[PDB]
Paper text:
F1Fo-ATP synthases are large, membrane-embedded macromolecular complexes that harness energy from the proton-motive force (pmf) and use it to synthesize ATP via a unique rotary mechanism. We solved the electron cryo-microscopy structure of the F1Fo–adenosine 5′-triphosphate (ATP) synthase from A. baumannii in three distinct conformational states. The A. baumannii ATP synthase has a subunit stoichiometry of α3β3γδεab2c10; its overall architecture resembles that of other bacterial and chloroplast ATP synthases. The rotating c-ring transfers torque to a central shaft comprising the ε- and γ-subunits, which protrude into the α3β3 hexamer, inducing conformational changes in the F1 nucleotide binding pockets, thus converting the rotary force into ATP synthesis.
State 1 was then used as a reference to build structures of the remaining two states. The central stalk is rotated by almost exactly 120o between each of the three conformational states suggesting common stable low-energy intermediate states in bacterial ATP synthases. Structural alignments of the γ-subunit between states revealed that the three states differ by almost exactly 120°. In F1, we observe the canonical “Walker-Boyer” state geometries in both the “open” conformation (βE, “empty”) and the “loose” conformation (βTP, with bound Mg–adenosine 5′-diphosphate). As in Bacillus PS3 (10), the third β-subunit (“tight” or βDP) is in a “forced open” conformation (denoted as βDP*), and we find only weak map features in this region, which we interpret as a loosely bound inorganic phosphate ion. The A. baumannii ε-subunit is similar to those seen in other bacteria, containing an extended C-terminal α helix. While the E. coli subunit ε bends here and protrudes “horizontally” between the αDP- and βTP-subunits, A. baumannii ε continues further upward into the F1 head, forming two more helical turns followed by a five-residue extension, which forms several additional interactions with the γ-, βTP-, and αDP-subunits. This may further stabilize subunit ε in the inhibitory “up” position, which blocks rotation in the hydrolysis direction, while still enabling ATP synthesis. The A. baumannii a-subunit contains an additional loop extension between aH4 and aH5. As the a-subunit loop insertion is conserved within the Acinetobacter family but is absent or structurally diverse in other bacteria and the mitochondrial ATP synthase, the unique a/c10 interface in A. baumannii represents a prime target for the development of highly specific inhibitors.
Residue numbers in the entry:
A (entry chain p): 2 to 52
B (entry chain L), F (entry chain O), G (entry chain K), I (entry chain J), L (entry chain R), N (entry chain S): 1 to 80
C (entry chain a): 15 to 291
D (entry chain e): 2 to 70
E (entry chain g): 194 to 241
H (entry chain P), J (entry chain Q), K (entry chain H), M (entry chain G): 2 to 80
O (entry chain b): 3 to 52
């Protein structure tokens, strides 16, 4: 009974993490990576600039 | 039987009430556009004024039917 | 089942496990002004928030940000930008309190995603080893802080701050004097109805209702969501629980929205209390 | 009936005469014009103009931007 | 340019502006200035 | 049976009441745009009146049906 | 008979209430477009005001009738 | 007894709400239709066909309720 | 007798309530267009404000009458 | 006994409110739809497909209510 | 006994309908107000003046109803 | 008990009914403006469609919630 | 006993009607606000201040209904 | 007792129903205008979306607060 | 639900603590991005110097 109900809820979090990857992870990861890229470029430009 | 009298009174009152409420909204909705149009084209005022009575006479048909039955209940009511 | 389900709906909405001084843990019937065992678990969630921010705070470096500190930089810059571009005039730790309340309510709301019964039923283990089984089965465990007392205490502090900046006008009389929705009603019996009652109703409604509105709006969100989750738990055999996944997706959507609205309206109200003259 | 239509460019007049109908593409969308129309003015998309004579013959004039009155 | 016209003889009708009047006025003014320049060039050609 | 008579009377009343309420607003909403359009294109008045008659006849069908049921209740009703 | 008096009071209240509700909304809907028209054509105020009086008198007829029946019930009602 | 009156009330509600909905819906459709056909008189038949398409799509549910009301009138359950 | 008192109370409440609901809608509907009219042509502000007052004084008549009947039921009610 | 009449009237309300909602909603949608297609006739198929999409999105809850009403009608609880 | 409950209902109606009216009224008034002030940003002061005037003119009947409701709440007749 | 069963059935019916009525109007109000917008900027169909889904998801939450309590009442009801 | 249920009904009405009013008023205001801001984006803060003045003036009476309802729920007269 | 439970159920149903009815129309009214605004100024999507969410959060307060007391009555009710 | 003033008391108290007590490590954090902008403006001025 009780555990059998929790079996369905096991399916739940499985599908939640499945949809979390495909939908939520790429945008956040891309935002992080891109902001890191603009920061790195801005500092590297300053480096060659000081040279 | 007194209960029947009260219920018939309520029904009759509803008959006039809803008709009046509907007609009041309808006439305002029509008149707003009518005034705006006559502002747009003051030249054609008689023609628009004719059309507006045409549709107004076409409008209140059903409510006037209900008011008749409402007055019918007040004086010569069935169920007695 | 049916008796068991009714007992369960007796169980999960038990207020803060209702501890009591000069008494035992609880009997589900005390219902007096006594101890509460939920916001302690909420503070157990706030402490990780402070520790996580302290991790970056102690590490003061201008180098290339790693992913975690990059994300925290996003958050701080976003809240700073909102506070700045929207609101201005004067600054006394306003953005800090805003960023604290935002993340704190967000993390509190976030905990709802866990199943209804996994934590309490795993807590049957600690029930078995200590304090017995039946005391756990009357009222022992609590869910994330969705109870109205949390949000009420939350909002009333903001109300106190509204008072504190609303006396910045250097005089209670100057602040109390305000424009009314009912400056005039010439008719004499109308004036009788107007003078005392309507104006008293005005001074009641002008400010007092707003924090109540905030607290109750957040409470409705939390309580409705959790009750939906408990109600879904029936008829498990032949189903994929399609009644749960999209609904919890919408719940994920509404969590951040509610946190954002709370934070934004709080700063709005502080700005209004900071209005010149 | 018929109404006076004049299509004039910045250099000279292109088309003129009496026409019964006009089709043009205004900023909002297509427009049908008949005599007695309420006063109106738009900006024309770069598309052809269609005018219907009383006899049934239909002349078409190409216009690239302009003002319709 | 003779703006005194159509004040005594103006009627009580306005157009039905498909775009907002501001954009229409801007579009009219640009083309009017361009036409003034063109017909000022043509007269110079005749003078030449 | 008295309460049954009263409830039947109430039902009969509300039948035509809602119909009148609907028709009054509907005709007004239609006629407003009708007058505005005929002002915009004064040449199409007969064609616009043809279309308006078509749609008006298509509109009031259900309220007229309800009026029939109401009258049926009034004169020759079931539940006796 | 007590319930009869109470229901008569209720019905009479409904009669006046719905009429007032309709008239209040209708007059506002009319006056809005009326103000737009008078602003756009300030030279045209009197004849538009005349039109507005015409349609306003045409508007509140049925609600005024309902007020009459309400007063009828209030002062001397049937069913006694 | 009282059940019969309640059935009568339910039947009245079914028809009345449907009529009220249809009356408003058709008027709202017709206002825009007339305005559109006034703007572009040439395209009258195609717009007219689009009308009947959308109107047949519209009047369904009230028509469904009408049948239920008539069923309660003639051959009702609960007796 | 208690039922009569309660029903009179309900009727009185309806009388004021519906009138208030109507007036609140109508005043706002008028005011929106009033604001547009005054903003578009600010020169005409006093004339437009006078016309709006005329419309308003013509508007609230029936709800104002209804409030009187409601208060009449409140203090000196019939049917007792 | 009194239960049955209440069941009937509840079932009537279920269908009635859904019909009232759908009738007004479809009219509101079709008004703009017809107004749009007249403005840009070349876009008729795409706009019509979008209209089907949103119409299917619209009538969901009323159709849900209709089934509950019918279940009350034929084989209901409370017996 | 029933008198108390019915008086409670009446008092509730008095407050409820007035609140429903005022909420709609101020909402649709303020929408138009914001639309207007956007057109003429310089003309804000007298716009607010007129808007406050008409707003004060608006709440009269709802305030009358609220007072009667509270009168019923505290010291009602019929007792 | 019988009366309680009837009343809870009524409550259940109300729960679904009002939600359906609300969502039907809401979706129509949104979709009309959506169809108007897409015609004005035909290139922006995908992003506008995504925004429309966002609004639709945000909209029907509360009615969908009420459907849950309605189903609860129909199947597993309290007060028994 | 009946008085308790009637007070419950009255309380439900008190919150519900004011809620229905606010839910429409705020939408009507916000729509015009969104149109206004999109047309003059650089004027956003002034419009927001006007809007919140409007909201504060608006939400008053429904709060009044909510307060009386809450008073009824916990500490009611008529007992 | 039984009647008290039935009335509690009815009141709880109204609490949910009216809130759903309000929100489902409010969100539609907001979203339509949002779509018009984003269509006219496609580059201002993010700030417009932020303004939206501010509005939406400020909007749904009173009804969906009433939802909470509705659920309260459903499960943990006074008057018993 | 139930008032249970203990809950709101602890909520306000621990809120005021967990906020004021740790406003400061945040106040540290505002500076890093700002000085990064300083760096990225000065490296912009260097080319004018060239």
């Amino acid at each position: 009974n009780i555990n059998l109900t929790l079996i369905g809820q096991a399916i739940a979090f499985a599908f939640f993490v499945a949809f979390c990857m495909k939908f939520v992870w790429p945008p956040l990861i891309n935002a992080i990576s891109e902001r890191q890229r603009k920061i790195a470029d801005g500092l590297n430009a300053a480096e060659k600039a000081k040279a | 039987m007194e209960l029947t009298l009260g219920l018939v009174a309520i029904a009759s009152a509803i008959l006039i009430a809803f008709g009046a409420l509907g007609t009041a909204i309808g006439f305002g909705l029509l008149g707003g556009r009518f005034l705006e149009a006559v502002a747009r084209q003051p030249e054609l005022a008689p023609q628009l004024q004719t059309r507006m009575f045409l549709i107004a006479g076409l409008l209140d048909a059903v409510p006037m039917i209900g008011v008749g039955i409402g007055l019918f209940f007040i004086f010569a009511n069935p169920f007695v | 089942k049916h008796h068991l389900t009714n007992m369960t709906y007796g169980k999960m909405p038990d207020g803060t496990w209702k501890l009591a001084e000069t008494a035992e843990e609880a009997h589900s019937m005390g219902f007096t002004a006594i101890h509460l065992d939920s916001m302690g678990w909420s503070i157990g969630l706030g402490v990780i928030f402070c520790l996580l921010f302290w991790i970056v705070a102690r590490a003061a470096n201008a180098g290339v940000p790693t992913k975690f500190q990059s994300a925290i930089e996003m958050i701080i810059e976003f809240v700073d930008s909102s506070v700045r571009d929207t609101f201005h005039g004067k600054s006394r730790l306003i953005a800090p309190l805003a960023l604290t309340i935002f993340v704190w309510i967000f993390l509190m709301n976030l905990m709802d995603l866990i199943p209804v019964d996994w934590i309490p039923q795993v807590a049957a283990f600690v029930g078995a080893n200590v304090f017995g089984m039946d005391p756990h089965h009357v009222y022992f465990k609590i869910v994330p802080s969705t109870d109205p007392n949390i949000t009420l205490g939350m909002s009333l502090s903001v109300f106190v701050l509204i008072l504190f900046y609303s006396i910045r006008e250097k005089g209670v009389g100057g602040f109390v004097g305000e424009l009314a929705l009912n400056p005039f009603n010439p008719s004499n019996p109308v004036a009788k109805a107007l003078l005392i009652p309507v104006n008293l109703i005005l001074e009641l409604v002008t400010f007092l209702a707003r924090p109540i509105s905030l607290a109750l709006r957040l409470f409705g969100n939390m309580y409705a969501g959790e009750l939906i989750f408990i109600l879904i738990a029936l008829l498990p055999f032949w189903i994929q629980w399609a009644l749960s996944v999209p609904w919890a997706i919408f719940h994920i959507l509404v969590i951040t929205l509610q946190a954002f609205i709370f934070m934004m309206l709080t700063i709005v109200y502080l700005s209004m209390a900071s209005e010149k003259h | 009936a018929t109404m006076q239509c004049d299509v004039v460019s910045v250099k000279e007049s292109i088309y003129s005469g009496a026409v019964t109908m006009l089709i043009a593409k205004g900023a909002g969308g297509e427009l049908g014009i008949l005599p007695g129309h309420a006063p109106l003015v738009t900006l024309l998309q770069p598309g052809p103009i269609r005018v219907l004579l009383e006899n049934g013959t239909e002349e078409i004039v190409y216009v690239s931007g302009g003002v319709l009155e | 340019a003779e703006e005194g016209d159509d004040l005594n003889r103006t009627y009580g009708w306005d157009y039905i502006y498909e775009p907002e009047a501001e954009e229409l006025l801007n579009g009219l003014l640009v083309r009017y200035i361009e036409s003034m320049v063109y017909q000022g060039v043509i007269e110079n050609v005749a003078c030449e």
